């Protein structure tokens, strides 16, 4: 079921974070508001495609 | 309404007569009316509560809830979180108007005419006086109701012993046998 | 024909400094699993219920009436 996953900054285009999900409870892609170390500002992060 | 007027006029000084109360605050009032359509068959088909709520909304002036389960019973096919029954509380002045409907209309429209059974004691001022049918009230539609289940009424007073509640219900209609 | 012979390692709990010491900042005092002794003055709790000393000083032990005990640090 579960999958080790990585996040993607939607502005600076980097692979920043790493976390988990359960791919039958969450069919669509994750979106959380996290902190980007490159831009030093809170930025939306999507799942890496 | 009628029944606060009876408390102000006749009920309270007759209570001070028949129990020798030293102050008016000692007099027992009435608090609640609790109603419970205990269906227990929405687990089989869920469209059984779907008309029990329709009947309770007409009978009361409120809507009922839907009750949870707290257990998991194998015999009746029960788990946690199961829709079973439906409470209706009553407070304020809708206590007394519903009691007016109970004293006047309802209680004399039941076959095997006897009124009120005198043993509902519980020692502490609570007469759960259940209802067998559903067709008793004036607002009941033969073209809508099918099942022949019934109601619950939990009369709740602040009286200590049941000698007091008998005299209160004697001074509030309530045709005991 | 035995299905036993399994253990965990020993993980070495217990108080790691006595009373009356001179105790530097941020050192462990009484490692627990499960809160057996609550903290008092200048003592905090980590993730696995251990007990520090925030300020430099002297560890002394107390008790909360009847049930459970306290650790507190007085500078000085």
């Amino acid at each position: 079921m579960r999958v080790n996953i990585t996040l993607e900054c939607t502005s600076c285009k980097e692979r920043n974070y790493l976390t988990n999900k359960n791919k039958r409870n969450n069919p669509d892609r994750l979106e959380k508001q996290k902190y980007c170390p490159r831009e030093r500002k809170v930025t939306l992060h999507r799942e890496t495609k | 309404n009628r029944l606060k007027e009876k408390y102000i006029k006749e009920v309270t000084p007759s209570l001070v007569e028949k129990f020798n109360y030293s102050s008016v605050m000692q007099t027992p009032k009435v608090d609640k009316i609790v109603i419970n359509m205990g269906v227990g068959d929405a687990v089989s088909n869920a469209k059984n509560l779907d008309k029990a709520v329709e009947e309770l909304a007409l009978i009361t002036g409120q809507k009922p809830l839907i009750t949870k389960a707290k257990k998991s019973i194998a015999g009746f096919r029960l788990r946690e979180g199961m829709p079973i029954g439906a409470k209706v509380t009553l407070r304020g002045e809708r206590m007394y108007e519903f009691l007016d409907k109970l004293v006047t209309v309802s209680l004399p429209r039941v076959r095997d005419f006897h009124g009120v059974s005198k043993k509902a004691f519980d020692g502490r001022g609570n007469y759960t006086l259940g209802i067998k049918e559903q067709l008793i009230f004036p607002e009941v539609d033969y073209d809508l109701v099918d099942k022949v289940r019934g109601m619950d009424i939990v009369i709740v007073t602040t009286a200590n012993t049941d000698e007091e509640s008998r005299e209160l219900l004697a001074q509030l209609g309530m045709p005991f046998q | 024909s035995t299905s036993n012979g399994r253990d965990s390692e020993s993980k070495r709990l217990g108080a790691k400094s006595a009373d009356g010491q001179t105790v530097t900042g941020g050192s462990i005092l009484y490692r627990q699993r499960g809160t057996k002794i609550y903290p008092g003055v200048n003592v905090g709790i980590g993730g696995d219920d251990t007990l520090f000393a925030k300020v430099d000083g002297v560890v002394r032990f107390e008790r909360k009436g009847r049930d459970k005990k306290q650790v507190s640090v007085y500078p000085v």
């Binding site: - | 007409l58 108007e97 006047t104 004399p108 045709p175 | -």
Partner: protein
């Protein structure tokens, strides 16, 4: 009263087939005939067949010539033959 999710009610004055008690309230409705000032200015149409005096738990023993339809359905056709 929580808003919008409670049923319909108007303080409807009672009546009766016999002697017409006019004091009370109600919830259901109809075509209003006697909006009455001495009571709630509402419907009269709750017109119950029962006085709670007509039943012999309050007034006394009054059913010998009780003369009600289905009662007379036997007790008029041979009821003239009875008496």
């Amino acid at each position: 009263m929580k808003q919008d999710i409670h049923p319909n009610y108007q303080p409807v004055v009672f009546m009766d087939s016999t002697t017409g008690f006019k004091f009370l309230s109600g919830s259901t409705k109809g075509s209003s005939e006697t909006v009455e000032w001495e009571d709630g200015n509402t419907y009269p149409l709750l017109r119950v067949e029962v006085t709670s005096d007509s039943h012999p738990f309050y007034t006394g023993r009054q059913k010998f010539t009780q003369a009600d339809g289905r009662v007379d359905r036997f007790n008029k056709k041979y009821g003239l033959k009875d008496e």
